[PDB]
Design a protein around this ligand. Structure first.
Ligand code: HEM
Ligand SMILES: Cn1cc(C[C@@H]2NC(=O)[C@@H]3CCCN3C2=O)c2ccccc21
Ligand SMILES: Cn1cc(C[C@@H]2NC(=O)[C@@H]3CCCN3C2=O)c2ccccc21
Ligand SMILES: [Zn+2]
Length: 403
């Protein structure tokens, strides 16, 4: 009877399993990894997720460590490496560099070109008669520019392609062999071992530069430590940004009334950004934590060493938190969504993410003539990715009204 994980819901149609688990009485339900056979706890209710992700007895670092019970088929690392950029920066005493390079000051430095670039990419599409692909010709250049200009430094087109390929090949439940999946991480690691210092020295204020230039104990930060930072930034910023912006465009274009309302009321755009983060399902897996001591939540005993997963998508679609959870309702006042997680490990990139998301929403809201070119069921999805992404977003112009 035991349920295997994940649920193979690669499109935006969420698996019926979440509702089945949310209806269970317990705050966590047992599942078994389809890949490793590890037994895992899974939370799907908003209430349970708040308590679990606020608990200091559950450790992210410990669930990332090699050997932990895991949901993914292969370890997400170059073998023999720590591959925990967050722990790295904490160890190096560099938490403030990340906060400073992703905080509201950083956003203020980048929002100008981010908005100009969103507008450049969208106005460039106004010339297309017939069907064009918003994924290839809007999301990928915008997400590539975000990663290069705010995170890694000046990337060549080939380097961008390599890093994007490593993320798509490594961050998967299925669709590639184990050796190909390992090779994604070793290729990314070897790339940054060679190039991270050079990238950190390219012009601009990208985060890798700030990290490489920050004083730490005993000489400059090592090539291995910079490499660990590089791989963290790729997996944190690249497939997330491209997957989310793709899914958010699909949500907007499936709700032309919402787009038309934002066209008439730009002051409503920030509320729509937050609802996009609740409503648009990004990940096919779960955030995870390891218990560092026995604990009991609402009757369930979790033993030290066991791993607790929280499905943010399940949580964001919990009808006990959100009335009509499967309705895209941009003026929803609350409650607070789990699109960026919760607690200690709440996404440190959230301000930069919101900045790019808002730029994208406004580029659409200015042009309510932008339409999906096919029915939503006619969109094809990359199967097996941790971060959902359609193969293409075919779009077309009904008219060219803009302001
Ligand atoms: C420039 C873009 C981004 C950067 C630099 C970034 C950075 C990061 C980093 C470093 C972490 C790990 C934090 C930790 O474990 O302490 C993280 C976690 C997270 N990020 Fe972001 N991120 C970006 C974009 C996004 C986007 C677009 C989303 C969702 C739409 C997102 C959602 C999340 C979530 C839910 C977590 C929590 C994972 C957990 O609890 O283990 N991020 N991000
Ligand atoms: C942002 N983010 C952090 C982790 C944990 C761990 N931390 C790392 O630095 C390395 C780099 C390569 C893989 N890593 C990890 O999986 C993670 C996993 C899946 C998706 C996104 C993730
Ligand atoms: C919505 N959302 C969920 C996560 C957790 C991440 N999701 C996965 O599928 C993979 C599978 C193996 C481990 N994973 C994780 O820890 C996440 C990270 C960054 C940005 C957004 C995120
Ligand atoms: Zn108008």
């Amino acid at each position: 009877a035991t349920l295997t994980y994940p649920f193979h819901d690669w499109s935006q149609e969420l698996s019926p399993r979440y509702a089945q688990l949310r209806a269970s009485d317990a705050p966590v339900c047992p599942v078994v990894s389809e890949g490793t056979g590890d037994h895992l706890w899974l939370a799907t209710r908003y209430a349970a997720a708040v308590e679990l992700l606020e608990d200091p007895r559950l450790s992210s670092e410990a669930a990332i460590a090699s050997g932990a019970p895991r949901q993914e088929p292969v370890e997400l690392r170059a073998p023999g490496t720590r591959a925990d950029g967050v722990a790295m920066l904490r160890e190096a005493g560099l938490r403030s560099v990340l906060a400073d390079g992703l905080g509201p000051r950083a956003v203020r430095r980048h929002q100008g070109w981010i908005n100009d670039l969103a507008e450049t990419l969208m106005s460039a599409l106004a010339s297309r008669e017939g069907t064009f692909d918003l994924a290839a010709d809007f999301v990928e250049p915008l997400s590539s520019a975000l990663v290069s200009r705010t995170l890694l430094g000046e990337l060549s087109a080939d380097e961008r392609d390599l890093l994007a390929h490593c993320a798509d090949t490594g961050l998967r439940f299925c669709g590639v062999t184990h050796e190909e999946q390992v090779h994604a991480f070793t290729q990314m690691h070897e790339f940054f071992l060679e190039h991270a210092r050079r990238l950190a020295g390219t012009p601009g204020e990208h985060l890798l530069k700030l990290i490489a230039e920050a004083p730490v104990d005993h000489g400059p930060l090592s090539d291995e430590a910079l490499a660990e930072a590089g791989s963290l930034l790729v997996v944190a910023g690249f497939p997330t940004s491209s997957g989310f912006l793709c899914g958010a465009l699909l949500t907007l274009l499936r709700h032309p009334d919402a787009v038309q309302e934002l066209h008439a009321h730009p002051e409503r755009v920030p509320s729509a950004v937050e609802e996009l983060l609740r409503y648009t399902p990004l990940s096919t897996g779960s955030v995870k934590r390891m218990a560092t001591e026995d604990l009991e939540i609402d009757g369930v005993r979790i033993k030290v060493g066991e791993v607790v997963m929280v499905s943010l998508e399940a949580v964001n679609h919990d009808p006990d938190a959100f009335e009509d959870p499967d309705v895209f309702r941009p003026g929803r006042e609350g409650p607070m969504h789990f699109g960026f997680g919760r607690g200690r490990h709440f996404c440190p990139g959230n301000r930069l993410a919101r900045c790019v998301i808002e730029a994208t929403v406004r580029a659409v809201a200015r042009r309510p003539g932008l339409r999906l070119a096919v029915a939503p069921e006619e969109i094809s999805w990359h199967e097996g990715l941790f971060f959902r992404r359609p193969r293409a977003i075919p779009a077309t112009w009904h008219h060219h009204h803009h302001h």
